[PDB]
Amino acid sequence: GHMKFTDQQIGVLAGLAISPEWLKQNIAANQLVYGIVKPSDTVPAGVDDYSYLVAADDQDGTIIFFKAEGQTVIIKYTSQRNTKLKAKALTLSQLKKEFYQTRSQKREVDDYVAGLRTE
């Protein structure tokens, strides 16, 4: 912990970085779930309390794992469910300066945080 931001707020940046259009299509109809891995369901290695973005209908379709630790985000995404994740490490600053530059944008980004499902 001892961090800043909230995971909710960071995941939008992490998926605007990785298929922003797929993030948008799903938020348009609220079809996007924000949920945590946990020792809960079938998952790959190295995500043990990572947040994962998927749509409720896109299970095998497309998926984006992320976790902010400190001032880094390790985005772990794939286009094939049955194979391991890629890795994009960025600083939390990188993502903020890509998808949180302006003041007006702080609406839209936080709007994508408030048009997700959580369960």
TrEMBL record:
Residues of the Lreu-0056-like domain: 6-117
Top-level lineage group: Bacteria
Protein name: Lreu-0056-like domain-containing protein
